[PDB]
Every structure is written in C-alpha cells, then in structure tokens.
Design a protein around this ligand. Structure first.
Ligand code: Z5C
Ligand code: Z5C
Ligand code: Z5C
Lengths: 178, 245
C-alpha cells in the first residue's frame, strides 16, 4: 500500500469535521458527535489499488494565517468544502481558499465538495435563507464554481445520512494516485 | 499512556463512561456539558501520548541505536521536552479535577462543575508565556523538521530500518514522525473549539459561564501571539533571503 495525504479546507460552518468523523467511523455517531478530529489513516482499495490515506482537518486554523499553512506540506489531494445550506460559504471559495491552496499545494488536485446536501429540501433551511434573499446552493452553482476554480471535479454528500461520503473519499484516493 | 487513564477514557463519551444508573440522575444539559469536558481531557491524554512517542520512542531510540551527526535529533524533534512538561502538567491538573469529583465507592462516576478556573490558570501568567514561547519556536521549526526527516529516510539505511521497525505496530498507524509533528502543531488550535462548546452548555452557574468566557479570550490571545511570532526556518537559508522577507 502506498501512502497518500488528504487535507480538507473550507469555512468554519462547512461541515468538514463532521465529514471526516463520519467517514473514519463509517457511521453518524448516535450518542456523541465529536467537537474535533485529530487524524486518521484509512485503508482504502480503489480500482484494484491499495492506499493508506492519511486524513487531516484545518478546523480551528481559519483565523491564523501563519499556523494554517503548516497543514499543507506534501498534500496529495485537497477536499475543498462548502455547505449547501450556506451560499456565503460558496462565495469564499474562489478568492480566499482557492489562491491559498494553489500557492502552498501547486499541481495538487482539488475536489470541490458540497456538504449537507440533505438540507437542500429542508423546510426550516429554506425559510431561514429566504429572509436574507437567499436559497440553498443549486447543483449547477456548485458545478460552475468547481469548473471556474480549476477543480479536478465536483461532488456532493451528506455526513448526516452518509450518502455520497464513501464516493468522495474513493474519488479523492484516485485523484491522489494520478 | 498508563492503563488506569486509558481505561477511564476508553468510552466514546462521558455518557458511555459513567454507570447508566448515575447518568439517569442528571439533566440533559449537564450530560451535554460533561460529554465536551470529557472530550477535552481525552484529547489532552492523547496529545501527551503523542509527545511521549516523540520523546521516548523516536528521539531516545535514535540516540541509543543510531550514529547521527550531532544536532540532527534536536532538528527532528524541536522543543519536545518543553512541550511534554507543559502538557503533562496540564493533563495532571485535569485528571486531578476529575479524580476529586468521583463519588465515594466509584472510579468512574463524576461531574466536573468548575473547569473555567483551571483553564484561566493554564492560559494566563508564566504558564501562558511558556506556551507562547515554546509553540512560537516549535511551529517556526516545523517545516525544517519535516525536510530533515525526509532527507534522512531517503539516504540513511539504518535510519530507514529504525523507522520501519518502531512504526510497524498497528497502535503506531497514525503516529509516524511527520504525523506527530502536525498533530502537535494542530493541538493549540483545537482548544477554542472545545472551550466554546463547553461554554455553550455552562450557563447554569453564572460564575462558570464568566470563567469559561475569560478562558476562551485568553486562549485566543495566546493563539494570535503564536501566529504573529512564526517565521519558518529553512536549512541553508541565506541572510539576504531572510532580510528581504
Ligand atoms: C450506544 O453505544 C454505541 C455507540 C456509541 C456511539 C457514538 N460514538 O456516539 N454511537 O453508538
Ligand atoms: C467508510 O468508508 C467506506 C470505505 C470504502 C473503502 C474502500 N473502498 O476500501 N474503505 O472505506
Ligand atoms: C512540501 O509541500 C509544499 C509546501 C510547503 C508548505 C509550507 N507551509 O511552507 N506547504 O506546502
């Protein structure tokens, strides 16, 4: 098995910590959802190839511009996250997160991931956003942003239901192998 | 880690650590507060363990088995003795707070009502100055340590065999040399996340809400100071590249 490193980036409310927790445990914790994620080394077999994929979170580093880049050395794949219930999290992708990752991780594939896809048809979410003249991120808005920023691809998932979670990490492993 | 502490923090939460007949006596808000305090202590026990792997397994093993050039082991593990002292002392205070809170006749049933004062003490005065000085030095030496590691692994056969030998056990899967260095750098930025969530469930006693609010502000001030004091060192950097920063 070859060793690859994955780092997830995005705004504080994008759901990156929850996504790493659910993947590493293979379940949405039923008793306690951890506040933080330390690291994990996942055994993944994708398209016949075995990989040890080390997983890292940047949560807590968003306000610290000199500590945060210390997470990037030798990264093989970036998951760039936004929450579908937060069009504001999608707006910070192209001119805040994207130039930073392109600078510290040149030539590293970026997968743009729309998290919390279960909230796209949630009534409480739609009511809350409509008060600020907003609506949940549409699939074409996510795809167009991924296309614009030069992302390797666009994917959606829900840490809450687990749908799409396995596929995101299997695709990230394939991107890291290229 | 020692077996007694490992067993006390084996469960995924405080609600699964205590006896169910003890859990049943508490309100939901107390359980939510205790679950986050338990996560802070459990992650601190794991962080101290990461530092013991760095000092005892890697550093001491390299000094006792390998013939490395002087100053190479210090370059791979900068400030590890100072970091171990800061966090082992902090962990000792957290575990003593839990131990004093145990019910008589129990080694697992407790409620910690007064964490804020301990956090203010850790993140103020000389202990905060020591944390600021040590992380400013550690985080500025982070990239140099990783590059030194990569160079030794690629060119030194005895170094490569030593690493492959001591990291072979399954309990070391997440704790190779580079993984330990990043785990330590990321530790300090976990504290505001844990403290803010404890504070969210600590409104019942106004003195505790105030103490956790003060602690959160102190941790953020420490992080801002560390972040402002970082400039990555690079082996063989010339003065001209430094003063043209
Ligand atoms: C009920 O004990 C099993 C268990 C633990 C958890 C958790 N980690 O939140 N979910 O299920
Ligand atoms: C929870 O992760 C699902 C998953 C898939 C794999 C794999 N494809 O080997 N490993 O984990
Ligand atoms: C070694 O990978 C490139 C690199 C360097 C850095 C850095 N933090 O200086 N981040 O990524």
């Amino acid at each position: 098995a070859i060793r690859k490193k994955l780092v997830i980036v995005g705004d504080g409310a994008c759901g990156k910590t929850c996504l790493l927790i659910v993947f590493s445990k293979d379940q949405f914790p039923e008793v306690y959802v951890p506040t933080v994620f330390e690291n994990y080394v996942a055994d993944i077999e994708v398209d016949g190839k075995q990989v040890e994929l080390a997983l890292w979170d940047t949560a807590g580093q968003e306000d610290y511009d000199r500590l945060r880049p210390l997470s990037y050395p030798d990264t093989d794949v970036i998951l760039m996250c936004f929450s579908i219930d937060s069009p504001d999290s999608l707006e910070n992708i192209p001119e805040k997160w994207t130039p930073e990752v392109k600078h510290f991780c040149p030539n590293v594939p970026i997968i743009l991931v729309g998290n919390k896809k279960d909230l796209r048809n949630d009534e409480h979410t739609r009511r809350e956003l409509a008060k600020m003249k907003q609506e949940p991120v549409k699939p074409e808005e996510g795809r167009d942003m991924a296309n614009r920023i030069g992302a390797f691809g666009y994917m959606e998932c829900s840490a809450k239901t687990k749908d799409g979670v396995r596929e995101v990490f299997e695709m990230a492993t394939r991107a890291a192998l290229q | 880690s020692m077996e007694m502490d490992e067993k006390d923090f084996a469960a995924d939460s405080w609600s699964l650590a205590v006896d169910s007949s003890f859990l049943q006596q508490h309100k939901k808000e107390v359980m939510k507060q205790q679950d986050v305090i338990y996560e802070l202590i459990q992650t601190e026990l794991h962080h101290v363990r990461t530092l013991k792997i760095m000092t005892r397994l890697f550093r001491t093993g390299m000094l006792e088995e390998l013939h490395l050039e002087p100053g190479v082991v210090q370059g791979l593990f900068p400030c590890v003795d100072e970091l171990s002292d800061i966090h082992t002392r902090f962990l000792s205070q957290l575990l003593e707070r839990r131990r004093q809170a145990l019910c008589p006749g129990s080694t697992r049933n407790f409620v910690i009502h007064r964490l804020g004062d301990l956090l203010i003490s850790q993140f103020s005065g000389p202990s905060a100055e020591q944390m600021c000085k040590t992380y400013s030095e550690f985080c500025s030496r982070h990239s140099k340590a990783l590059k030194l590691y990569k160079e030794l692994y690629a060119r030194d056969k005895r170094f490569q065999q030593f690493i492959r030998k001591v990291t072979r056990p399954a309990v070391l899967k997440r704790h190779g040399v580079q993984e330990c260095i990043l785990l330590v750098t990321q530790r300090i930025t976990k504290y505001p996340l844990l403290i803010s969530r404890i504070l969210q469930h600590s409104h019942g006693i106004e003195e505790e809400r105030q103490d956790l609010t003060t602690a959160l502000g102190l941790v953020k001030e420490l992080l801002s100071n560390v972040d402002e004091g970082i400039y990555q060192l690079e082996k063989g950097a010339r003065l001209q590249e430094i003063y043209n920063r």
